[PDB]
Amino acid sequence: AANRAPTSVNAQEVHRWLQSFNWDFKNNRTKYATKYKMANETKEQFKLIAKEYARMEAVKDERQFGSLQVALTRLNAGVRVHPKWNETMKVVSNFLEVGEYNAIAATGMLWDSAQAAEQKNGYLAQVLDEIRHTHQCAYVNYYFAKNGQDPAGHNDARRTRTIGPLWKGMKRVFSDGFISGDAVECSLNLQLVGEACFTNPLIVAVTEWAAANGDEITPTVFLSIETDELRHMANGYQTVVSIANDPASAKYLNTDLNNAFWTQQKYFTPVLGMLFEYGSKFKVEPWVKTWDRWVYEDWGGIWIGRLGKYGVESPRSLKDAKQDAYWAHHDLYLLAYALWPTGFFRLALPDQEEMEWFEANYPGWYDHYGKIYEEWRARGCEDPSSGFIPLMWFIENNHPIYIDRVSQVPFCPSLAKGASTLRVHEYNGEMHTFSDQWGERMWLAEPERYECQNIFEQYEGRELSEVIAELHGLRSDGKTLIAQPHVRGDKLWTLDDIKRLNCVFKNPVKAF
């Protein structure tokens, strides 16, 4: 023609000159405290340009929505899900949502940290991706509230999450863990350990367990989140590459990595086993098998082995984390069910097939956990007229529930089959409780990082139903609780049934 059609468009032709976009001036430095220097001339793996990033994601979106809005709505997919998994997805989607959201702020910090324009560009794509993911996890709760069998909790989790104890630990690994500290510590929490060891495996596993329990909404969304996650693990790798030639790495990198690994596994080993095994009806695989493949073999072995040439070693706490893995999820669900009035989701006792499954996969589950669940059932924990909440059994059998001060995981050392060591200290007029040597060192070395009030400190001397009423843990009839000790549509507990119990929180540390 008069010449022919070209374009440049292709992001690679423009990306070739990105990197030269940054210039030197005194004060072109990061605004954040850090022990490390990220090299300029750090290159990035994906040759993205803003416009092409947008096109790349828009294509994924139109397929995702489109399936959700036409076909799955016509098939009534929101309704035809096992009641237990409908409940598990309130936690899974809203809690993942906070991690998606704090990963926005986190790679804003890392974009600031980086001096290379390409590395800044790598973390910029992830800023934007974590905004996509925040609205995707919100859209899963949006759709199940709109179209599912129990919208309570899916519709208001951003405010009803605040009533219960498991929310605090989620905030430590996936909110504060991602943004508060040295930018590289945050990066090891988020990208090196968080996304590569747990989020990338989990999003795919959640999809399998979803598919088995009738859910085809969560595969539509989560399989689209997963197509982004590889650029995010390229970013973590690149954080290490950018700091590997600095003297500071050989002094500090493996300690920030070990503390980050401990942080993440501490919450995820018991919580993810608990939601997979106790929150499904159809079971895919035992968590003991899964954890070992994910943590020990794939991450600890392969992913970290790829970084050994940059001076990374496998965390020195990997062994301790594997000795508390087997029982920790079983241990935790006893406490989560015992504290069922403070959640925003309905919970069910194991049925006889599940107990048979648990006992085949965990020899000795029944004599410990099985017999307590049977005694709670007989005492009448599912029925409102019993006057029994399992917390009462912990009190009448003197089994204190402590909250860790660092990770915020609840633990009950007198009952636990897991590695449970209570450490209690008083410092400057306040008592603090720890569950393990790693969190204890973190607090001892860094007390002013770990000042979070726990559930018993804040609720002390308050009767349970007035906490629930104040923090709005109620269905739209203003009477029946969101959160139930059974997953059936009949004999739902109401605020008055809780008021009858006359259950008043006490701080467990006042007994020392």
Partner 1 sequence: ERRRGLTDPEMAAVILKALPEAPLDGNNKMGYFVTPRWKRLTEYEALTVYAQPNADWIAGGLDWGDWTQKFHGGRPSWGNETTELRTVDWFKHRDPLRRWHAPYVKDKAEEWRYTDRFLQGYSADGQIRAMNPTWRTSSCNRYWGAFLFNEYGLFNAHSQGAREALSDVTRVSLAFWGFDKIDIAQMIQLERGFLAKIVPGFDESTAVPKAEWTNGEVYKSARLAVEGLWQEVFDWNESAFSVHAVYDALFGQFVRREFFQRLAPRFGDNLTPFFINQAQTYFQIAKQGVQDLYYNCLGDDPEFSDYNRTVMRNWTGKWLEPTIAALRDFMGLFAKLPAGTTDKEEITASLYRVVDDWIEDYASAIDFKADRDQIVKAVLAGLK
Partner 2 sequence: LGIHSNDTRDAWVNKIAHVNTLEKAAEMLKQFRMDHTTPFRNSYELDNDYLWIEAKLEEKVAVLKARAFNEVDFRHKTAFGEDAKSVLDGTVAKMNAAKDKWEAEKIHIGFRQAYKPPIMPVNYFLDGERQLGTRLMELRNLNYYDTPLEELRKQRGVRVVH
Write phi, then psi, for 426 (nearest 5 degrees): -110, 135
Q: Is 486 annotated as a binding residue?
A: no
**Minimum distance between the CB of residue 305 and partner 1, rounded to whole angstroms?**
28
Binding string, 69-88, against a copy of itself, x = CB under 8 A? Answer: xxxx-xx-------------
CA distance 317 to 306: 19
Site for partner 2 in 223-262 (CB under 8 A): 248, 251-252, 255-256, 258
- Residue 65 or 366 having the CB closest to a copy of itself: 65
54 in contact with a copy of itself (CB under 8 A): no
Question: What does 66 interact with, of partner 1, a copy of itself, Fe ion, none (CB < 5 to 8 A by kind)?
Answer: a copy of itself
30 in contact with partner 2 (CB under 8 A): yes
- Residue 185 or 215 having the CB closest to a copy of itself: 215
CA distance 448 to 452: 10
* Contacts of residue 184, Cβ cutoff 8 Å, sequence gap at least 6: 34, 35, 36, 113, 239, 243, 253, 256
Candidates 90, 133, 423, 432; binder of Fe ion (CB under 5 A) is 133
300 in contact with partner 1 (CB under 8 A): no
First-to-final CA distance of the chain = 89
Neighbours of 287 (CB within 10 A): 26
> Helices 247-278 & 437-445, crossing angle to 10 degrees?
130
Candidates 24, 396, 448, 477; binder of partner 2 (CB under 8 A) is 448
CA distance 68 to 221: 9
Q: Is 154 annotated as a binding residue?
A: no
- Residue 157 or 455 having the CB closest to partner 2: 455
- Both structure tokens of 80: 């035809």
Q: Is 87 annotated as a binding residue?
A: no
Q: Is 229 annotated as a binding residue?
A: yes
- Both structure tokens of 309: 């040439």
Write phi, then psi, for 161 (nearest 5 degrees): -55, -30
Site for partner 2 in 178-217 (CB under 8 A): 181-182
Binding string, 332-371, against partner 2, x = CB under 8 A? Answer: ----------------------------------------
**464 three-class SS:** helix
- Both structure tokens of 343: 């959640």
Confirm whether 137 is a catalytic residue: yes
Neighbours of 16 (CB within 10 A): 10
Site for a copy of itself in 198-257 (CB under 8 A): 216, 219-220, 223
Known binding-site positions for Fe cation: 100, 130, 133, 195, 229, 232
Q: Which residues bind a copy of itself (CB under 8 A)?
A: 62-72, 74-75, 216, 219-220, 223
Residues classed as catalytic? 137
